[PDB]
Nucleic acid binder design. Sequence first.
RNA 1: AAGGUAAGUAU
RNA 2: UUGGAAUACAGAGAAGAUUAGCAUGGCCCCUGCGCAAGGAUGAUUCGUGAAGCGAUUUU
Length: 159
Amino acid sequence: VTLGVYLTKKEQKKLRRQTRREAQKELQEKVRLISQGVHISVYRVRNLSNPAKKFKIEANAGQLYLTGVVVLHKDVNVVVVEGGPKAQKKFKRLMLHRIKWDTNKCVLVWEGTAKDRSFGEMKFKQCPTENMAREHFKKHGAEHYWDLALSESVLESTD
RNA sequence: AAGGUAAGUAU
RNA sequence: UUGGAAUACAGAGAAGAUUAGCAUGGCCCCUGCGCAAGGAUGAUUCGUGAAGCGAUUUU
């Protein structure tokens, strides 16, 4: 709604002169007297068993005030984050360029916009089977992203 | 003839 | 400390001058304050339970 009001250097300079003049006058007088849409990303990594990388991902999720989950399974790590656009962009730039995995590769499965946040805080869930992770994702209403990540992992393993 | 009144200040 | 004295006046600038220094302002380098903002990095016996280990008879 509001627009930024910028001026040229000369105009500013005139203001400075006036400002200093006013200041001098005063001095001389003192001496003389996440709502409306939240960005939700979901990335798929081959191996997330490293404690240092998981701690760095948890620190990047907690410092950016973004919620979500990090589910681990048999060669399928689904990291879902949700928050603002700048926090999601910083998390994607950290997980795509700063977080060095290497046969272990991390790629972003999906990145969209939702109405509100689903999870409360970043909880590192763990499940050896995919049915428990699917039930944990459906308990918070995010089973479609986990199913899409599992289908993308199956298509990457088959092809 | 002249071209040679200092001005100022209140009485 | 008393009391009073206090044409004339003044007169070529006095209708108070001349010269000079420092700071500030302004300008601009650096730095600081306030502040918009993105970028990437890093963290003695029996019974039961538990644990360890691994050549007489198929002539």
